[PDB]
Design an enzyme around this catalytic site. Structure first.
Site, PDB file in Angstrom:
ATOM      1  N   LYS A 126       0.603  -1.117  -0.348  1.00 19.75           N
ATOM      2  CA  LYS A 126       0.607  -0.089   0.109  1.00 19.75           C
ATOM      3  C   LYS A 126       0.988   1.500   0.408  1.00 19.75           C
ATOM      4  O   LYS A 126       2.314   0.910   0.533  1.00 19.75           O
ATOM      5  CB  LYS A 126      -0.670  -0.092   1.176  1.00 19.75           C
ATOM      6  CG  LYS A 126      -2.222  -1.274   1.023  1.00 19.75           C
ATOM      7  CD  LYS A 126      -2.867  -1.109   2.336  1.00 19.75           C
ATOM      8  CE  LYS A 126      -3.606  -2.397   2.095  1.00 19.75           C
ATOM      9  NZ  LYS A 126      -5.373  -2.606   3.518  1.00 19.75           N
TER      10      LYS A 126
ATOM     11  N   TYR B 210     -12.488  -2.498  -3.833  1.00 23.46           N
ATOM     12  CA  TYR B 210     -12.809  -2.774  -2.323  1.00 23.46           C
ATOM     13  C   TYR B 210     -14.935  -2.750  -1.979  1.00 23.46           C
ATOM     14  O   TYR B 210     -14.917  -2.176  -1.399  1.00 23.46           O
ATOM     15  CB  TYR B 210     -12.509  -1.195  -1.291  1.00 23.46           C
ATOM     16  CG  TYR B 210     -11.187  -1.389  -0.615  1.00 23.46           C
ATOM     17  CD1 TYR B 210     -10.801  -2.512  -0.201  1.00 23.46           C
ATOM     18  CD2 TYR B 210     -10.178  -0.637  -0.970  1.00 23.46           C
ATOM     19  CE1 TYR B 210      -9.274  -2.659   0.050  1.00 23.46           C
ATOM     20  CE2 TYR B 210      -9.130  -0.424  -1.159  1.00 23.46           C
ATOM     21  CZ  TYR B 210      -8.781  -2.032   0.124  1.00 23.46           C
ATOM     22  OH  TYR B 210      -7.043  -1.880   0.863  1.00 23.46           O
TER      23      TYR B 210
ATOM     24  N   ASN C 259      -1.629   0.329   7.246  1.00 26.49           N
ATOM     25  CA  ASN C 259      -1.852  -1.219   7.513  1.00 26.49           C
ATOM     26  C   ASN C 259      -0.469  -1.723   6.514  1.00 26.49           C
ATOM     27  O   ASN C 259      -0.535  -3.129   6.783  1.00 26.49           O
ATOM     28  CB  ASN C 259      -2.345  -2.045   7.772  1.00 26.49           C
ATOM     29  CG  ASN C 259      -3.844  -2.048   6.843  1.00 26.49           C
ATOM     30  OD1 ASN C 259      -3.463  -2.284   5.529  1.00 26.49           O
ATOM     31  ND2 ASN C 259      -4.270  -3.376   7.104  1.00 26.49           N
TER      32      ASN C 259
ATOM     33  N   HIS D 148      -2.457  -5.093   1.015  1.00 30.28           N
ATOM     34  CA  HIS D 148      -3.244  -6.325   1.272  1.00 30.28           C
ATOM     35  C   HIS D 148      -2.832  -7.927   0.765  1.00 30.28           C
ATOM     36  O   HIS D 148      -2.182  -7.813   0.492  1.00 30.28           O
ATOM     37  CB  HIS D 148      -4.271  -5.505  -0.363  1.00 30.28           C
ATOM     38  CG  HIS D 148      -4.778  -6.317  -1.120  1.00 30.28           C
ATOM     39  ND1 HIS D 148      -6.328  -6.557   0.173  1.00 30.28           N
ATOM     40  CD2 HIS D 148      -4.905  -7.595  -1.379  1.00 30.28           C
ATOM     41  CE1 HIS D 148      -7.298  -7.266  -0.200  1.00 30.28           C
ATOM     42  NE2 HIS D 148      -6.371  -8.235  -1.661  1.00 30.28           N
TER      43      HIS D 148
ATOM     44  N   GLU E 215      -9.628 -10.658  -7.764  1.00 30.28           N
ATOM     45  CA  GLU E 215      -8.260  -9.789  -7.848  1.00 30.28           C
ATOM     46  C   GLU E 215      -7.379  -9.877  -8.369  1.00 30.28           C
ATOM     47  O   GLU E 215      -6.970  -9.616  -9.359  1.00 30.28           O
ATOM     48  CB  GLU E 215      -7.897  -9.539  -5.908  1.00 30.28           C
ATOM     49  CG  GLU E 215      -8.988  -9.322  -5.386  1.00 30.28           C
ATOM     50  CD  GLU E 215      -8.677  -9.204  -3.690  1.00 30.28           C
ATOM     51  OE1 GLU E 215      -7.178  -9.731  -2.972  1.00 30.28           O
ATOM     52  OE2 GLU E 215      -9.139  -9.451  -2.933  1.00 30.28           O
TER      53      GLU E 215
END
Ligand SMILES: Nc1ncnc2c1ncn2[C@H]1C[C@H](O)[C@@H](COP(=O)(O)O)O1
Ligand SMILES: [Cl-]
Ligand SMILES: [Cl-]
Lengths: 140, 142
Positions: A10, A50, A113, A116, A127
């Site tokens: 990320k 998402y 965080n 993913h 995905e």
């Protein structure tokens, strides 16, 4: 060992310049990087990615954080790849992540965080197909 | 302080197969270079031939081409102060036999043919090599 999962480093972790350290977590654990690219997601693409969380109050935040900067996206291949990557990432909230997981080592918060990973076989399929044509995924 | 530069780096098929992409990336990132474009690819013979045109009349040309296309590679643009030279110092001498200890080629290269990495050798080749592999809309300075 042909199972594949979709990983994203990320914008927070890209900005820390720890792409290599995170890649080594994957590689040292026996996963192979079989597709990869650096991209900057559009809002619309982050929203599609998402989509399952569209109704949740953290939706806008997942989206904003994913498009705040470039990301490194890759397909990880190997035996038990989906669950192994999850084990390597650690808990979603980095305060709860086990010592030595990617999130415990590189994540500032539940928003920032670091990574993913696909959570299931069907989400891995979707995905991977979202970000890569099969001709740019190179099993080995 | 010197000029912020971009250079083109390739992790060759030998080193991809070794699963040391992360280790090599950390060499760049710990030296203060930033990965600003990246993609994994498997080059065609023609694309490898184009890319190595400056060596077209040389006798190691066929070997350069066959080795570059023997498996997937990891391609990236590296950005930072003095990036071109910095990357080259990190890579080490072309011949891993001659490469200083701690360089990418010393640590990951098995031979002059299987020598783990490429880096642009000058500003003009950097420009051409980056444009060959990436559109500017997929290079993200930060
Ligand atoms: N102020 C400043 N800081 C850092 N890098 C800079 C600056 N101005 C230009 N550049 C970059 C552009 C080139 O990669 C290199 C030399 O500029 P060239 O004109 O292309 O020879 O430096
Ligand atoms: Cl996520
Ligand atoms: Cl080369």
């Amino acid at each position: 060992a042909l199972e594949r999962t979709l990983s994203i480093i990320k914008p927070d972790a890209v900005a820390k310049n720890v792409i290599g350290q995170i890649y080594s977590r994957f590689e040292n654990a026996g996963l192979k990087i079989v597709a990869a690219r650096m991209a900057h997601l559009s809002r619309a693409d982050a929203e599609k990615f998402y989509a399952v969380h569209a109704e949740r109050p953290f939706f806008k935040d997942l989206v904003e954080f994913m498009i705040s900067g470039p990301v490194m996206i890759q397909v990880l291949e190997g035996e038990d790849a989906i669950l192994k990557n999850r084990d390597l990432m650690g808990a979603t909230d980095p305060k709860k992540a086990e010592k030595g997981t990617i999130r415990a080592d590189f994540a500032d918060s539940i928003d920032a965080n670091a990574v993913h990973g696909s959570d299931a076989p069907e989400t891995a399929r979707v995905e991977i197909a979202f970000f890569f044509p099969e001709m740019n995924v190179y099993s080995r």
